[PDB]
Amino acid sequence: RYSKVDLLALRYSPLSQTPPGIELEGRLRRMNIWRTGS
C-alpha cells in the first residue's frame, strides 16, 4: 500500500508533527522514552 518513500515523504507533514496526547506523553515520559527536549 505504501512504499518507503511514500511513508517518508509524510514524515514532516503538519499532522505528522502533531504531538502525542497528554496521556500518551505522560506515559512516554514515565517510561523515559520521550524524546528529550521535544
Binding site: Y2, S3, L7, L8, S13, P19, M31
Partner: protein, 167 residues
C-alpha cells in the same frame, strides 16, 4: 490522513529483575495511519538511546510480543544479528523495518505479526516475527524481501528461527 492496512501497537520492554519477563513488557500506544505513526516515532527515543536490556516491538492486530500468543505460537522469526554497527545505522535499520511493516511491502504481509529490536551488550538484534513456521513460501518471500530492502551487508547475517522449542 493516510490509513494503514492494519492497526499497529508499540511495546517497550524494560529490564527489571523484580518483574517477570512478561511483566517487563509495556503497552505504549496504537495507531492506524501514517501521520499518527510519525507523530509517535518523532517523539520517542531511537533504539540508540534506550537502556541496555530494553526492547522496542511493533505488532499488528493486537498481537502481544509473546510466544504464548496464538498468532505467534506456531510461528517463527527472521533474526538479524548486528555487531558494533554504528548507532545511526542501527536506528536507520530499525526504522527501515518499521516502514516495511506498516507499508505492507511484503507480498505475504498477512503472515507477518510484528518486529522486535533487542539492545544488548556486545550485540543488538532485530527480528521479524511470522505467524506460521511451516510455511516456507511465506518465510522465504519475506526473507528475500528483507536483504534487498534492508540493503544488508555481507557481514550481517539473516537467519530464520522457530519460536517453539523443536528441531
Amino acid at each position: 490522513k493516510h490509513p494503514l492496512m492494519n492497526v499497529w501497537t508499540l511495546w517497550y520492554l524494560e529490564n527489571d529483575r523484580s518483574k517477570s519477563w512478561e511483566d517487563m513488557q509495556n503497552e505504549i500506544t496504537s495507531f492506524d495511519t501514517v501521520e499518527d505513526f510519525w507523530s509517535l516515532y518523532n517523539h520517542i527515543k531511537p533504539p540508540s538511546e534506550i537502556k541496555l536490556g530494553s526492547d522496542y516491538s511493533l505488532f499488528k492486530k493486537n498481537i502481544r510480543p509473546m510466544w504464548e500468543d496464538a498468532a505467534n505460537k506456531q510461528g517463527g522469526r527472521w533474526v538479524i544479528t548486528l555487531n558494533k554497527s554504528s548507532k545511526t545505522d542501527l536506528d536507520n535499520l530499525w526504522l527501515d523495518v518499521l516502514l516495511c511493516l506498516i507499508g505492507e511491502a511484503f507480498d505475504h504481509s498477512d503472515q507477518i505479526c510484528g518486529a522486535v529490536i533487542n539492545i544488548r551488550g556486545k550485540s543488538n538484534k532485530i527480528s521479524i516475527w511470522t505467524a506460521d513456521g511451516n510455511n516456507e513460501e511465506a518465510a522465504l518471500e519475506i526473507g528475500h524481501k528483507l536483504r534487498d530492502a534492508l540493503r544488508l551487508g555481507r557481514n550481517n547475517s539473516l537467519q530464520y528461527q522457530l519460536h517453539k522449542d523443536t528441531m
